[PDB]
Amino acid sequence: EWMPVTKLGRLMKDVKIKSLEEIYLFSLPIKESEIIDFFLGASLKDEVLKIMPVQKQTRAGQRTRFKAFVAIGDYNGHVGLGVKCSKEVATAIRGAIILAKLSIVPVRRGYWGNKIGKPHTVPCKVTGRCGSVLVRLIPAPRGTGIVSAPVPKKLLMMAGIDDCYTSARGCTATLGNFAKATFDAISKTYSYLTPDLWKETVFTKSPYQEFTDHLVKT
Amino acid sequence: MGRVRTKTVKKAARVIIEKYYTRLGNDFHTNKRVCEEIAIIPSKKLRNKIAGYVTHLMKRIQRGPVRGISIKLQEEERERRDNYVPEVSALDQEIIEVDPDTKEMLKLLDFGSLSNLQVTQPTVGMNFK
């Protein structure tokens, strides 16, 4: 099965850190993929955004490598987006998922402007861009559904974001860019100094301190 | 007359001299027989090409330790050379130079230590453009 090469994996396999929260507060790197599958194997539903074949010239027959775009989500507050290239579409589609699980980031869902019930939309107007694709997320009232192209209508949905207006920049044809941007925006919810925040945080002894007494074991 | 012995020979020979450094010598004929006893060399030729590098490599190690192998009888020589301890000479016994502004840092630290005074403020030469 799974004997780890990381301290986190050492500390994780033994049930000693319970949730991605404690992994996300200190923004520890996720160096193995089994960490998330131990926390989130259920509802980690795979999908394949596209399989784009790219070709590199050569003096011999022009070579071909395929690309696999896979997002991962739970409709409850996490989203990933992985890419990969290889000379066989079976490993590219297998490798994309693993790289997609590693890039999993938390998303914050807020209210449109009335503060009763479960969160249902992006907190505030967030945006991102890679390769000129500029996906804006604009808060929406409860019970509207998502409004966007089929590509980021998925990335947003896997976050559990029920109702989010959006507006996109020109040149969205390339899923390598249009999916990357809409993933970049949802990562950017826990990056706003909102007036809801500003309550002084108290640093709470990153797992390596509290759990070094066992972690010196061999 | 000779060739580059590839990474097969160079890696094989470096481990031998790293594991049996005491049982080896200077002369090829001695080393040829030794290698067969301690290593299962598949081919007659390469055994005489491994034994070739070993005797060439010993001619290296007697002439200033080199950067390839780890020898315990040579390493212990280093640790005696890296743990040497004379009577303290870092203390700089009495009056030792301090530049004129250095004592002013000390008198601002309120230290009455004894040291030297020069004069150097007239500037007469420094960096080049």
Binding site: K7, K31 | R81, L109, F111
Partner: protein, 208 residues
């Protein structure tokens, strides 16, 4: 930094510093480094506030001692001047030293000939002991550098303003820094000279 006979600056320590020329810096001042330069005399070389060095050298000591396990801190040196010293620091403290060429990717690249995940870097020189300063960004690593008056202060948490060009200056402070990180944990009454001299940490070629 403190109020002790054993914590505040002692004449015995200051004679050590002036002996090995820790106060002479270089000919340049980096804008992050102005807060540790007393004045510039007329030959064109900078004088370091040895007291300000003490606070930082005591602050850096307070950083290391907080680490629960001695092995969790990786002390790294990539100049031939201080290679022997950092070996001695781990010997008298219990650190995991790194002398010689820094294999790029010892903190990343899981599948590694040499792999560590430490909790604190201690780099001799920010300029020439380069890589660990940059591999201390891909995983969350605090940094402790004996910063000169010319070394950049990028990706460094604690800057001990000191001369580090000469062999004497670096050898001193590795002995000096080791003395402070040890004492706060307990080796002597603190009312004694520590029985190992700085020359043990000094650089020396075979010369009899």
């Amino acid at each position: 930094s403190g109020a002790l006979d054993v914590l505040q600056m002692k004449e015995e320590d200051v004679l050590k510093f002036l002996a090995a020329g820790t106060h002479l810096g270089g000919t340049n001042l980096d804008f992050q480094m102005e807060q540790y330069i007393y004045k510039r005399k007329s030959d064109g070389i900078y004088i370091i506030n040895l007291k300000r060095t003490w606070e930082k050298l005591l602050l850096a000591a307070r950083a290391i001692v907080a680490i629960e396990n001695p092995a969790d801190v990786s002390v790294i040196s990539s100049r031939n001047t201080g290679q022997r010293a950092v070996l001695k620091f781990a010997a008298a403290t219990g650190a995991t030293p790194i002398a010689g060429r820094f294999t790029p990717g010892t903190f990343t690249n899981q599948i590694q000939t040499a792999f560590r995940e430490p909790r604190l870097l201690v780099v001799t020189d920010p300029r020439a002991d380069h890589q660990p300063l940059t591999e201390a960004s891909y995983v969350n690593l605090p940094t402790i550098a004996l910063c000169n008056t010319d070394s950049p202060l990028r990706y460094v948490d604690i800057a001990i303003p000191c001369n580090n060009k000469g062999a004497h200056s670096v050898g001193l402070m590795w002995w000096m820094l080791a003395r402070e990180v040890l004492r706060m944990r307990g080796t002597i009454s603190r009312e004694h000279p520590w029985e190992v001299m700085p020359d043990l940490y000094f650089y020396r070629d075979p010369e009899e």
